């Protein structure tokens, strides 16, 4: 899902939010995409889905 795009989300919070809005729009869910992305980035998306 973007080779270096994904690391730049652990770095940049703005890019990470943009991508989170895109993952939400395609209803990727908390557990469906877990174990395809890092644990830190997962715990974040779990919060982004809950409130956005």
């Amino acid at each position: 899902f973007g080779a270096n795009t994904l690391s730049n989300m652990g770095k940049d919070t703005i890019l990470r939010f943009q991508m989170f809005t895109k993952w939400k729009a395609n209803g990727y869910l908390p557990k469906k995409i877990k174990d395809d992305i890092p644990r830190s980035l997962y715990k974040a998306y779990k919060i982004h889905y809950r409130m956005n």
């Binding site: 919070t13 703005i14 939010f17 974040a44 919060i47 409130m51 956005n52």
Partner: protein
């Protein structure tokens, strides 16, 4: 560590230290929204609604509610 989501910034997803309000009525951490306007965007991040002002206004009553919630826990 039971942090209410209303106190979280939509971009940082963490507790807000300096919450500010934009013309749409949405609240963000100052450093986060400042970077979003620095990157050229003229849009409310959460609502995509285009902004009518660049003024960021501190949300003092929320700063109070966060500060109260911080001293209890």
């Amino acid at each position: 560590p039971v942090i209410p989501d209303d106190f979280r910034c939509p971009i940082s997803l963490e507790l807000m230290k300096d919450p500010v309000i934009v013309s749409t009525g949405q609240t963000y951490e100052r450093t986060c929204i400042e970077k979003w306007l620095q990157a050229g965007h003229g849009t409310c991040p959460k609502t995509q609604q285009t902004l009518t002002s660049t003024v960021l206004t501190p949300n003092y009553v929320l700063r109070s509610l966060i500060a109260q919630w911080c001293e209890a826990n």
